């Protein structure tokens, strides 16, 4: 069971910078084994290179509440009723940083929140046919009564409003499509599948 | 409760295509309302434009099984032990096509699967800080005993292997990180939250 081939079965011949700006787009040139027993020819794929992220689900296990952050995401505009989204605390991981240190820093900058205990949720590839981006989600213990107001770093044009909802309310917003970004959907579905055990662990 | 601002509260000044090849990278230039009042100055964001996708979770409600498709995703290479991933049937939506039309066509091309009934799962933004991509997931009724072999369009260098596993095994592979692409994580978490009702609905 499981996948068929490993890194022994693919060679990346070269990568070519197609675009270099804030982010990059790279042409990967590679060959790989085929399920029928042969080797492919040279394949090329355009890959959006934008680094990787840490994501924090801020969960108050005493109150059974979730902290959401609201901010504009212009890329949502063309397919959404509004480009302002309800999301998880999150940010890019820079060289030498840990997932958990980024999560804590962003929780303070984006929601004014201190974080207590943490546990991993899941680490996922956002859209691996066209981007390398991986996002690593943690759940962090918070006191949701301390989560309120307008945050974000103005010098980076980051304008963020905190919302506090019950867990059940956040999950219903997923089921209704009011929360519809991957990081939040994955985190809140995970929470709906693990909240009993997590609340026990964090309130004993 | 809910979001604060709408499309009336943002002005997209211009979009500039910075790169065009198979996909595009666009620079959005815009200004938007601020939570504390007033308007931002001009902000620019680089946005990866690659269209939008339909995703099909193939679920056999008689057997409580899912059909997975395996193929290489070279963008996974740098952060994964292998770039061959276990994934949902999925494909790009072309002009005029519906999510359902694409899901049914791809199920045949990628897994040799006829699909009976379908239902919506969720529609999500893959990573809206840097890409506009939206993926719309359906669950599709299949006979997993018909699922086997190698598929994909060899003329597009699409080499795909079918795997059939129990729902429980697929979900445990999500928990373990062996399935870690957003579309499959979201779909299989949804299935874990809804399978009892879905099996009752589809075996009446
Ligand atoms: C055709 O069914 C659209 O689906 P897709 O491109 O999402 O699926 P896939 O099978 O991932 O892609 C369909 C075809 O689109 C092209 N394609 C997909 N992703 C890329 C990429 N990153 N760069 C270049 N070409 C790509 C390839 O020709 C691929 O065979
Ligand atoms: O950390 P993050 O940039 O991912 O979080 P975000 O709040 O998405 O971004 C932090 C900062 O990085 C920059 N940034 C994020 N996404 C983009 C983008 N698509 N294009 C240009 N700059 C961006 C912005 O200055 C933003 O203030
Ligand atoms: Mg952020
Ligand atoms: Mg931030
Ligand atoms: Mg596909
Ligand atoms: Mg296909």
Fold topology:
The structure is a homodimer of 204-residue chains.
Chain A: E1 10-20, E2 24-32, E3 43-49, E4 53-60, E5 65-72, E6 84-87, E7 89-92, H1 99-111, E8 118-125, E9 134-141, E10 150-151, E11 160-166, H2 167-176, H3 182-203
Parallel strand pairs in A: 4-9
Antiparallel strand pairs in A: 1-2, 2-3, 4-5, 4-7, 5-6, 5-11, 8-9, 10-11
Helix pairs in contact in A: 2-3
The complex binds flavin-adenine dinucleotide (FAD) (2 copies) and magnesium ion (MG) (4 copies).
Concise structural overview:
Chains A, B: This is ADP-ribose pyrophosphatase. 2 copies of one chain form a homodimer. By secondary structure, chain A is α+β, with helices and mostly antiparallel strands.
Would you identify the CATH architecture of the largest domain in chain A? Alpha-Beta Complex
Oligomer: homodimer
Radius of gyration of chain A: 20 Å
The CATH superfamily of the largest domain in chain A bears the name: Nucleoside Triphosphate Pyrophosphohydrolase
PDB class: hydrolase
Keywords: ssgcid, structural genomics, seattle structural genomics center for infectious disease, ADP-ribose diphosphatase, hydrolase
Assembly: dimeric
Entry title: Crystal structure of ADP-ribose diphosphatase from Klebsiella pneumoniae (FAD bound)
Structure description:
- 2 copies of one chain form a homodimer.
- Chain A has 2 domains: 7-49, no CATH class; 53-203, Nucleoside Triphosphate Pyrophosphohydrolase, CATH 3.90.79.
- Helix content of chain A is 22%, strand content 37%.
- The first copy, chain A, is built from 3 helices and 11 strands.
- Chain A has helices at 99-111, 167-176, 182-203; strands spanning 10-20, 24-32, 43-49, 53-60, 65-72, 84-87, 89-92, 118-125, 134-141, 150-151, 160-166.
- In chain A, the strands form 2 sheets. In chain A, strands 4, 5, 6, 7, 8, 9, 10 and 11 form an 8-stranded mixed beta sheet that branches.
- In chain A, a hairpin with a 4-residue loop joins strand 4 (53-60) and strand 5.
- In chain A, helix 2 runs antiparallel to helix 3.
- Chain A starts with 9 loop residues before the first strand and ends with a helix.
- Chains A and B meet through strand 1, strand 2, strand 3, strand 6 and strand 8 of A and strand 1, strand 2, strand 3, strand 6 and strand 8 of B.
- The structure holds flavin-adenine dinucleotide (2 copies) and magnesium ion (MG) (4 copies).
